[PDB]
Design a binder for this molecule. Structure first.
Ligand code: SF4
Ligand code: SF4
Ligand code: FCO
Ligand code: FCO
Ligand code: SF3
Ligand code: SF3
Ligand code: F3S
Ligand code: F3S
Ligand code: CL
Ligand code: CL
Ligand code: CL
Ligand code: CL
Ligand code: MG
Ligand code: MG
Ligand code: NI
Ligand code: NI
Lengths: 264, 581, 581, 264
């Protein structure tokens, strides 16, 4: 019984979203790859290189035209005619456009593909640009975060395979299931916020009792994600549980909203 | 065509030109070109970084306390090492000393990363260069169980287990949807494992893909999440409370018990799965002890890492030794100084950057990152590189040198430095390892040796995790809980102008961050990263870097199938996002 | 002394008396006494429950919606089954119908508990009656590996693994602190496994102790916690949201993915560890197919369980069949009606309770729980018992009967009822099991057979977990999300006077709760639990219960060491807190 | 090197605390038994029965007099001369007194041993009585809950072994580390309580969004435990996360504070 074809491409990025995917606890990434999808192209994991990798890319997008899902990690730079990111001797943007043309739908993994992330922070030397400003004629599901949560990535994949449809999205293209509520609206330190019980300097008595991180710059009040509910790494922790405020890493432009340690 | 001599090599761009773009099973974007002679032997090799983002430019104007979070995103594979170098650099500039528990927890973060990064590289990135996955379908499950049981005490070895793994692979391939195995190099004559060893190795590939997720739960406890954990200038944010009200809000005995459980499992996997598989690859591929030497018998470099005395970065503190060897003289390990302008310098005469004088090298406190895409004649156009022009500018990677010398960094470099400084544990491990393979010491200076040293280091790091955990627990038993210093948190307490260096040994080699602070903001932030050294382009003297040297002189069986090129490049664990930043 | 005849037994209390108090490796408090003749054969057996709490009294005047939470605390081993029987009883009284997903999730809760309870009993409670732990120290690790590999595909079988387990046991006992193994029955002539089978079994005891903790994560997802998950009258409180804002506050795709991962792991452990170990115990202990028959060839009872059609408790809906057999006539499976006053009755002429007429039985809707500690003419005194007087009152357990007959309940009873009703899956499983042992069908009616049926049922329940999970996902794909009916939640909507029955099959056998509601409060709440049936004292005709019958006619090798008594009692999985409530 | 002797006895109980202990994820209960302590008497797990079990009990409390820890699960009934709970033909209370006299310290596991739990709820037919009303001359550490959290039980054991001292306690004898704060002061649904966002009937739209359970009877505001932070079963869930209000099960008298569905 055939599995759905998936092409996974990489622009300007740090590879954190691929690393997050392989951390999945349920289903294991092994079982996603062997039993749920056909991961037919992926630079980080595939055996073939060079001309052999170009043959796989060409063959899959032609054979499965109109029927594969395109996963995108990273983004295209518009500076230097696109040659800040080079793939087979040519601008990355050319490979992005050819892969997008045959896809049935696109998943934009991470803040890079969704919005820009760190390379797009001031002064954006390469003119790094998110996927939806280049590809304008295809369904794009944004899954933001730096990176997104591992078991969120795998839950979105299983939803699409099991239910044979795209997740319903908000006005920005984010899945409602995991991005519909703010971090601060499901945070276990909210009792302390409401009582005016705050950490004021690192490792003070308040910090040692798990008081709220608002005065240390927490951006939870303006950030939509699942970190305070689903949590990270098989439910082990999340940024605030281990004592650091949320940076805002799921939101467009979070690097340029002032210092991480200045109040929301 | 032309020819010249450097470092004992004859660099000759006559003959057939081969291009490998993209290089896969690495982090990020790389292109490689070679020329081969009439005997199918490489006489020229060209290393090219095919991406750039500009973190050094983006960091200007930031608050120094925020810098770690930005530079962490240089890389998601070596996640955390750039945050560590950043907080070290900012603390060096301002004059901050952290508490002992913060230093111990940082050392746990770094040892955890070494274990994770080395394990995933061995199986998921390099493994398919050595294991013929499709040949595993021809194996006898009972003979596979016998082989595995001869090599290890690991429990998972039954004939039924190996039959079940084989059958899962059979069902996966039978419909033609080969996924990550499509159009691979299967059957190439350089695949030398017997079928039973291929099925054992493939089973272990799957076990490692599952198990690696558990290792980073240590980063989740102390750092909130992985990838990309959190840190602070002044220590760590993970406040400790063992025996007071509100321990539910802090690192408590339950959280510490979780960490101990992960340490034990991590050591057992590395020692009983990874270590025997590395030795088996060595037993079946002994000729690779004489291929890919490159610079490893000439020039090697380590900064050192793991300060065991808090806030002391000297020789008596660092558990992983630093030093440099040049000119093949392993009897004189030289001291490294990251402030000395005559030591670390970067050249851009063969890279896509502007300097006022491209014939000189700049120390990072004098560094310039002014991108300039200028490929010259590439037999196509500026947006269609058919053949890079290695006589001119050919990469987004700058060219670092040490006292003007081209160096190799990473696990093999570190092992050679520690061995020749006389570290007793290293000498005994290396000697025992080469004895078991019936090879001379010189066999470690090779593509095979890089792989063997990486596995040895995963074992070393798993041991040090337990040592550091025990040190933390001793402090807690003595009532010493502190995790942050905040005396100099506020900008009004800092010098008006100051500068600092942060350094460590990342999984791939020597890492430095150079930072200058003025008026409360970052004035300059320059990074030199391990893959920047190894993947370097040429300099004004025409000297070649570690990758180009290791490829020189290599025989190819089938020019159109670049398996030998992939084996040697992957042995260094290239990280291209790191190299360019 | 006296002698009388009942149920084909000669009950004779002449001769030597043996006492076993406490019975260990059970839940709660039990005392057993026997008489043995000068041939070391049991001629009299006495079952005594040595605890009481009084839940039926405590429930009076409570809100019916709260009852599940109180009665769940009847037992922490069979945790959840009393909550399920309670919500069934209150819904039957008031006239509530739950949505399909609530019924499917309840069936998942019950199948999870069957898997968990049966696994822990096999290894942690009964295992050491069959496995000689100290004899494992004499095994050869290679011969242990060869045995395990001949029996199963399970991966964990290397010679080095078995050596490591044996060395852990060797270290554990080397300081003379034998812990749970101290003063055991090791070396008794009835221990028949070879050393290699003892080491295999001991390794699996440790693997099961670790793995059982994972199974109950399914209870944590749907029910909050284990032990003692949460439930509601009207369905379940675990609201579902797959594709809308706020799914992070509900059972979502990530929570369902966790449940599926646990189901697959649970099936794999039961089928490849527990099942082959049960068959191995059978192969080495065939004489125990003829010991401990008791009532199992005479009278057996099941109410049935797992309604597949929501709110339908009839024969076409229940996946685990109900029925009764009496007089050894397995050709006549009779229907059970829990409302009929002539079917289920409890007697107290030999128990510590008051009735108006102790020579008759009372149906639970007419039940009375009026405690009366009156041990009569014991050897010793009322606070220092040397011998119970089984001619008068001797237990805190009431004596249930079905149409006046004494019955056995539990896995063997259910297997016999399903087999003789012609359930295809049961017939095939039992036939294949007994063929593998070269034993007749009658061999299942025995102490060995109770153990074999328990392992069969764990495999059956793990298969049904997957079936129920798939049914839930089919409803979600069709947009059917509902988990609670609330139109009769408020007391003003209920009948002023009503009564109901909730019934199921717990791990140990047939369970019923009978409730009467009047004026918004509980007026009567009577429980009859599986170990109440099995551990029952005598009735006015002198008829004996399942434990006392199974112990009759048993040979003992060494009177002072009760191994044969413990083997037979533990084969029923006694739960004494359940029996007395 | 010798391990600390532990004697574990059982009064009137349901055995939930023993079951909770064996669920421990870190350290595994296997490793606690083999390597951390010497579990020298325990009716649920031991090989020996009857006269052989009585010999173990006698030998251990004699050879290790003054040196063992006594763990108690359940409680003694005062009714019917104590014969509502019989061990070796005598009242359980006699075994409790003999075991306590030789102990260095006593751990009262669960609400039964700490306070009374379900058998002590009105009208308390057996006169079930908590440990500290019978044993008045020994240190008693109360670890309440029905049952307590698995990884709380194992963390208290590891603390005592590692640090060679009893945990610091509140005025009721509960370890400060896990019982110092209320469920409601670390609850991830507190944002909803503060906003007046409540479930009003089961499976309403509020319930499907994870709103606060106060109007459904949640007793989190008056209950001290670790369920909303440490959570249950290797961090997988807790009562409120799966949609039921807290019953109050760690607090003295929780069964007789009104219906579980009446507001706090
Ligand atoms: S820690 Fe951050 S998200 Fe949590 S309550 Fe405080 S401000 Fe809100
Ligand atoms: S659900 Fe309970 S503990 Fe949580 S905020 Fe609401 S009332 Fe408080
Ligand atoms: N290791 C690693 Fe990444 C590289 N090169 C860094 O620093
Ligand atoms: N199984 C179980 Fe417990 C008993 N007997 C109940 O009901
Ligand atoms: Fe996963 S590539 Fe890592 S930087 Fe922020 S999302 Fe991008
Ligand atoms: Fe663990 S025995 Fe279970 S009832 Fe409430 S604590 Fe008691
Ligand atoms: S920094 Fe990112 S990982 Fe979650 S807690 Fe904040 S959205
Ligand atoms: S019912 Fe008990 S388990 Fe925790 S959430 Fe409330 S104290
Ligand atoms: Cl790509
Ligand atoms: Cl952004
Ligand atoms: Cl006891
Ligand atoms: Cl209470
Ligand atoms: Mg740089
Ligand atoms: Mg009853
Ligand atoms: Ni990197
Ligand atoms: Ni029970």
């Amino acid at each position: 019984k055939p599995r759905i074809p998936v092409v996974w491409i990489h622009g300007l990025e740090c590879t954190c979203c691929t690393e997050s995917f392989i951390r999945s606890a349920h289903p294991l990434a092994k079982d996603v790859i062997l039993s749920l999808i056909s991961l037919d192209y992926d630079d980080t994991l595939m055996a073939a290189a060079g001309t052999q990798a170009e043959e796989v890319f060409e063959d899959i997008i032609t054979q499965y035209n109109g029927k594969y899902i395109l996963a995108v990690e990273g983004n295209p730079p518009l500076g230097e005619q696109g040659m800040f990111c080079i793939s087979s001797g040519r601008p990355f943007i050319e490979k992005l456009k050819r892969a997008a043309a045959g896809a049935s739908a696109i998943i934009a993994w991470g803040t890079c593909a969704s919005w820009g992330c760190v390379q797009a922070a001031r002064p954006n030397p390469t003119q790094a640009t998110p996927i939806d400003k280049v590809i304008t004629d295809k369904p794009i599901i944004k899954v933001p975060g730096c990176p997104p949560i591992p078991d969120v990535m795998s839950a979105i994949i299983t939803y699409m395979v099991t239910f044979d449809r795209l997740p319903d999205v908000d006005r920005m293209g984010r899945p409602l299931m995991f991005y519909g509520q703010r971090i601060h609206d499901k945070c276990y330190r909210r009792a302390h916020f409401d009582a005016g019980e705050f950490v004021q300097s690192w490792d003070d008595d308040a910090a040692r009792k798990g008081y709220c991180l608002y005065k240390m710059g927490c951006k939870g009040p303006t950030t939509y994600n699942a970190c305070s509910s689903t949590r990270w790494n098989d439910g082990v922790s999340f940024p605030i549980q281990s004592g650091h405020g949320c940076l805002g890493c799921a939101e467009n432009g979070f690097w340029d909203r002032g210092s991480f340690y200045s109040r929301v | 065509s032309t020819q010249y001599e450097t470092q004992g090599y004859t660099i000759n761009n006559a003959g057939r030109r081969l291009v490998v773009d993209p290089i896969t099973r690495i982090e990020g974007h790389m292109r490689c070109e070679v020329n081969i002679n009439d005997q199918n032997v490489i006489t020229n090799a060209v290393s090219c970084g095919t991406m750039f983002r500009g973190l050094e430019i983006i960091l200007q104007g930031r608050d120094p306390r925020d810098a770690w979070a930005f530079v962490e995103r240089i890389c998601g594979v070596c996640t955390g090492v750039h945050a560590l170098a950043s907080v070290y650099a900012i603390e060096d500039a301002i004059g901050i000393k952290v508490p002992d528990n913060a230093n111990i927890i940082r050392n746990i973060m770094l040892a955890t990363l070494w274990c994770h990064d080395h394990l995933v590289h061995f199986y998921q990135l390099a493994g398919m260069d050595w294991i013929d996955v499709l040949d595993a379908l021809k194996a006898d499950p009972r003979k596979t169980s016998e082989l595995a049981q001869s090599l290890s005490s690991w429990p998972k070895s039954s004939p039924g287990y190996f039959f079940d793994v084989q059958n899962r692979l059979k069902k996966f391939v039978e419909g033609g949807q080969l996924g990550i195995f499509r159009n691979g190099y299967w059957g190439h004559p350089q695949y030398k494992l017997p079928p039973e060893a291929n099925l054992m190795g493939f089973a272990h590939y799957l076990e490692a893909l599952d198990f690696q997720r558990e290792i980073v739960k240590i980063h989740a406890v102390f750092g909130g999440k992985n990838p990309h954990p959190n840190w602070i200038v002044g220590g760590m944010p993970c406040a400790i409370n063992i025996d007071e009200s509100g321990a539910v809000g802090a690192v408590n005995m339950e959280r510490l018990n979780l960490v101990q459980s992960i340490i034990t499992r991590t050591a057992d996997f590395i020692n009983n799965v990874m270590i025997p598989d590395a030795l088996a690859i060595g037993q079946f591929n002994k000729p690779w002890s004489e291929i890919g030497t490159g610079l490893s018998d000439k020039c090697v470099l380590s900064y050192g890492a793991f300060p065991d005395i808090a806030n002391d970065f000297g020789e008596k503190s660092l558990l992983m030794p630093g030093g440099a060897v040049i000119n093949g003289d392993f009897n004189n390990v030289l001291p490294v100084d990251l402030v000395d302008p005559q030591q670390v310098q970067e050249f851009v005469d063969h890279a896509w950057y502007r300097y006022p004088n491209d014939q000189v090298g700049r120390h990072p406190f004098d560094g310039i990152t002014d991108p300039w895409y200028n490929p010259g004649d590439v037999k196509g156009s500026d947006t269609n590189i058919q053949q890079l022009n290695e006589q001119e500018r050919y990469s987004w990677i700058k060219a670092p040198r040490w006292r003007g010398n081209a160096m190799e960094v990473g696990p093999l470099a570190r092992t050679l430095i520690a061995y020749h400084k006389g570290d007793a544990a290293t000498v005994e491990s290396v000697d025992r390892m080469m004895s078991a393979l019936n090879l001379p010491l010189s066999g470690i200076q090779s593509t095979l040796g890089r792989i063997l040293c990486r596995a040895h280091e995963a074992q070393w790091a798993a041991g040090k995790l337990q040592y550091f955990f025990d040190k933390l627990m001793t402090n807690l038993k003595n009532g010493n809980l502190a995790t942050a210093s905040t005396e100099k948190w506020e900008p009004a307490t800092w010098p008006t102008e100051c500068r600092g260096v942060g350094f460590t040994e990342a999984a791939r080699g020597a890492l430095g961050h150079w930072a200058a602070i003025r008026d409360g903001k970052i004035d300059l932030y320059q990074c030199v990263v391990p893959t920047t050294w190894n993947a370097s382009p040429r300099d004004p003297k025409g000297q070649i870097g570690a990758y180009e040297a290791a490829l020189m002189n290599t025989k190819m069986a089938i020019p159109e199938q670049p398996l030998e090129i992939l084996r040697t490049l992957h042995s260094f664990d290239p990280c291209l996002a790191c190299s360019t930043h």
